[PDB]
Enzyme design. Structure first.
Site, mmCIF file in Angstrom:
data_model
loop_
_atom_site.group_PDB
_atom_site.id
_atom_site.type_symbol
_atom_site.label_atom_id
_atom_site.label_comp_id
_atom_site.label_asym_id
_atom_site.label_seq_id
_atom_site.Cartn_x
_atom_site.Cartn_y
_atom_site.Cartn_z
ATOM 1 N N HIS A 122 0.778 -1.113 -0.112
ATOM 2 C CA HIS A 122 -0.063 -0.089 -0.141
ATOM 3 C C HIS A 122 1.100 1.178 -0.079
ATOM 4 C CE1 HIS A 122 -2.506 2.975 2.116
ATOM 5 N NE2 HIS A 122 -3.644 2.052 1.933
ATOM 6 N N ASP A 199 3.466 -4.469 7.781
ATOM 7 C CA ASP A 199 2.370 -3.459 7.824
ATOM 8 C C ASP A 199 1.033 -4.502 8.151
ATOM 9 O OD1 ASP A 199 -0.013 -2.458 6.968
ATOM 10 O OD2 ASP A 199 0.477 -1.557 4.880
ATOM 11 N N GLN A 202 -4.203 -5.205 7.499
ATOM 12 C CA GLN A 202 -5.251 -6.142 6.892
ATOM 13 C C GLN A 202 -5.151 -7.546 7.503
ATOM 14 O OE1 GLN A 202 -7.968 -5.038 5.294
ATOM 15 N NE2 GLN A 202 -7.090 -2.861 4.681
ATOM 16 N N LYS A 225 -9.955 -0.071 11.080
ATOM 17 C CA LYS A 225 -10.345 -1.359 10.197
ATOM 18 C C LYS A 225 -10.488 -2.514 11.310
ATOM 19 C CE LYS A 225 -7.731 0.043 6.394
ATOM 20 N NZ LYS A 225 -6.477 0.474 5.781
ATOM 21 N N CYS A 363 -5.048 2.829 -3.267
ATOM 22 C CA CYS A 363 -3.452 3.134 -2.707
ATOM 23 C C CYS A 363 -2.662 2.133 -3.030
ATOM 24 C CB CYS A 363 -3.805 3.527 -1.062
ATOM 25 S SG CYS A 363 -4.569 5.105 -0.930
HETATM 26 C C1 LIG Z 1 -5.450 0.770 5.090
HETATM 27 C C2 LIG Z 1 -3.922 0.133 4.906
HETATM 28 C C3 LIG Z 1 -2.862 1.294 5.581
HETATM 29 C C4 LIG Z 1 -3.112 2.689 5.791
HETATM 30 O O1 LIG Z 1 -4.029 2.747 7.196
HETATM 31 P P1 LIG Z 1 -4.500 4.080 7.593
HETATM 32 O O2 LIG Z 1 -5.387 3.323 8.686
HETATM 33 O O3 LIG Z 1 -5.046 4.828 6.310
HETATM 34 O O4 LIG Z 1 -3.137 4.671 8.137
HETATM 35 C C5 LIG Z 1 -1.746 0.628 5.133
HETATM 36 N N1 LIG Z 1 -1.532 -0.504 4.784
HETATM 37 C C6 LIG Z 1 -2.451 -1.610 4.408
HETATM 38 C C7 LIG Z 1 -2.463 -2.824 3.885
HETATM 39 C C8 LIG Z 1 -3.832 -0.836 4.311
HETATM 40 O O5 LIG Z 1 -4.898 -1.773 4.045
#
Ligand SMILES: *Cc1c(COP(=O)(O)O)cnc(C)c1O
Ligand SMILES: *Cc1c(COP(=O)(O)O)cnc(C)c1O
Lengths: 405, 405
Positions: A122, A199, A202, A225, A363
């Site tokens: 992302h 990261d 998800q 999320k 994104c």
């Molecule tokens: C949504 C997301 C982000 C960013 O998260 P924010 O809550 O907008 O900072 C980074 N990585 C992944 C895989 C995402 O789905």
């Protein structure tokens, strides 16, 4: 075992109507709806116990401080960190990645070094590293994708070398649903002395996450999320690395002393990384979201969600000219394109039916470029979604294709 | 004209009891209580219209986006900025000052330059400048205080010179209640080509704030002190300066394009300064707080608060051995020490009476050092506070002094 009906009754937005039709919310990967337990935990805090939190002497302020530190401890147990002090409160995954990139990155990545990312990342896990590389004169290397949406792991021997300082890698793709083999990639990275940032934006809502079994150096995720409020997220850092990191934002509460003639000194980790008034309301809400998810049980959630994903993929086979992107064992999201129709149009028709999907580049421009498409549609299939919402999506795509083909 | 009883009935925490006694909350300068209109605006958004906001095609997401941009416009009118696009959403005053210090500061302050602050600044308006000065080799200069808590403006000719790039100055002191003569200091700063950042964290809840009449270059404030949620604040920047500032945090939504072979390009102001999912819930709550305050009327609030401050100062004259710090025309806060008793003890007794005051250095160590005290107590007298709470504070200090003297 899980009851989707009981779960859905906790989420007030799921009763809404959109365009005169019953909402089918399939965009939880962008942001999740929140249960009334989470919404109410925050509202009750504002109605009855609100105060500033920097260990104020008065009662409300001392009790708000303890609530905030108890949330830190609960989040630390949720990801199995060895201690609450390895967790920093941030605005979200994006801010956590920026904190690491500046604070750890500016002192550990030098001219001539390299950093490794992947082609499915992302923008949050790309841009901060492009900025760091440009500040320090380092190189950004990229693990390429295979057509099925998995990483080409055979390219790792060409990317890792003695100058590789960090691997920044997604746990679960927000588009493809791919779960990367983190433990094995981290073992590899550590053989070269490289650190690993994961990261996990998800990953944390779909299955148990254990940072001590992963052995990751940094792990980040967002509360919105994970069925929680906006404006709050978590950055986990191994204690030994965190203890050596310098401050990123400066201001109140991250200092030990402030002097205009002798300079300023910093407090200890994690508090050195938290400048100014924190998002106390968001932190109370995040604790409640972690209790809610834990009471349902992440292994129960994972079983229900996997069953729902199997059902959707099986029904989506009756949509003519559907293209899917990602592995068959994908988690949470289904990325697709319908015939030659632009995703923007398919998403607009799905919205006219009351169905909320995301359309665009999600994104993840490099990922769209890999697949040679400008955009994709994406359906998220979370724990509160149902077989009937999947049928509405399938019927709608068949109707769309009939109409525009 | 104002009705404190009607106003108080909107704030649910003001009915609470602490230690078995009726709460007298005199710590609004640390963080304010929130009206049910603000608490409910946010909870209603989560219960009925929640979705991600980056101009998603589906209905909930497009309507949440418009709510967020309408809040931007309302905040811009609240401070009289020429446009909504001069305002950036941040976590609070502290984060806004850090954004300016990095983004504007790293490109405009060079080795050999100087930056001017004052001796009454909060740590949020000190530390980011100490960090900037240390990164670029610049000098940090300090406007000294007078015994009455006002700035020594006669020292300005020695501090401003041709190398002075910025003046970072508080609108209203969080300890002393001093209101600085901003318009005149900004005229002075601009004659040398220096820019001016104003810390307005303690100004926006007490009287109308007009950034075009001030002519300030940067202006910052936090929502939680302005009767709104935590986790949200505003950074105002003149359009011509903002348009030239480079991004600070990187990630999704602040980019125009992302490429792993051709680099990344940025979107336009203000969106280039907002990376990742914003605090949407906090932004909905902040709009509601601005509507609530505007419906009461800031000139009405100012008249009531000034009357209450005059009453308290007049009653505090019957406390033996009370030391006050700050000018007689102070706004919002009363900073004091009682005889030779440590503030920590006076604050602990006041809390045992149900009275919440702040004690300590108030994130203003240089200010405590000026007065040669380690700490002070501070009573805040906001729009929902009453004559009866002031009497309880006066009686309590008399009781304390009788007991411990
Ligand atoms: C949504 C997301 C982000 C960013 O998260 P924010 O809550 O907008 O900072 C980074 N990585 C992944 C895989 C995402 O789905
Ligand atoms: C409270 C305060 C700050 C910091 O605000 P946060 O909301 O904690 O970022 C900065 N300056 C002054 C004068 C303040 O009172």
């Amino acid at each position: 075992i899980f009851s989707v009906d009981k779960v859905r009754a906790d989420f007030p937005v799921l009763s809404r109507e959109v365009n005169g039709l019953p909402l089918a919310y399939l965009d939880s990967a962008a942001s999740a709806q929140k249960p009334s337990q989470v919404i109410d935990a925050e509202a009750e805090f504002y109605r009855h116990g609100y105060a500033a939190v920097h260990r104020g002497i008065h009662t409300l302020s001392a009790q708000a401080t303890e609530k905030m530190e108890n949330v830190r401890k609960r989040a630390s147990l949720f990801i199995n960190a060895r201690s609450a002090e390895e967790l920093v409160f941030v605005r979200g995954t994006t801010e956590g990645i920026n904190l690491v990139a500046n604070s750890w990155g500016n002192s550990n990545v030098r001219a001539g070094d390299n950093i490794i990312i992947s082609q499915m990342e992302h923008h949050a896990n790309i841009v901060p590293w492009q900025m760091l590389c440009a500040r320090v004169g380092a190189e950004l290397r990229v693990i390429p994708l295979n057509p099925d949406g998995t990483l080409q792991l055979e390219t790792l021997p060409t990317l890792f070398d003695e100058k590789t300082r960090l691997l920044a890698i997604t746990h679960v793709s927000n588009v493809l649903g791919t779960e990367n083999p983190l433990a094995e990639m981290i073992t590899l990275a550590h053989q070269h002395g490289a650190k690993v940032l994961v990261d996990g934006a998800q990953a944390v809502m779909h299955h148990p996450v254990d940072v001590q079994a992963l052995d990751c150096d940094f792990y980040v995720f967002s509360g919105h999320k994970l069925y929680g409020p906006t404006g709050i997220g978590i950055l986990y850092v191994k204690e030994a690395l965190l203890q050596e990191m310098p401050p990123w934002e400066g201001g109140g509460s991250m200092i030990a002393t402030v002097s205009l003639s002798e300079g300023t000194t910093w407090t200890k980790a994690p508090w050195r990384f938290e400048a100014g008034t924190p998002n106390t309301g968001g932190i109370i809400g995040l604790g409640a979201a972690l209790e809610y998810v834990s009471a349902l049980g992440l292994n129960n959630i994972a079983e229900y969600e996997q069953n729902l994903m199997h059902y959707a993929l099986s029904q989506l086979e009756s949509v003519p000219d559907l293209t899917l992107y990602g592995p068959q064992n994908r988690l949470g999201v289904i990325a697709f394109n319908l015939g030659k129709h632009h995703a923007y149009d398919v998403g607009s028709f799905l919205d006219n039916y009351g169905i909320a999907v995301r359309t665009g580049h999600h994104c993840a421009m490099p990922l769209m470029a890999y697949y040679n498409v400008p955009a994709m549609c994406r359906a998220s299939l979370a724990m509160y979604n149902t077989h009937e919402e999947v049928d509405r999506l399938v019927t709608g795509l068949q109707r769309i294709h009939r109409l525009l083909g």
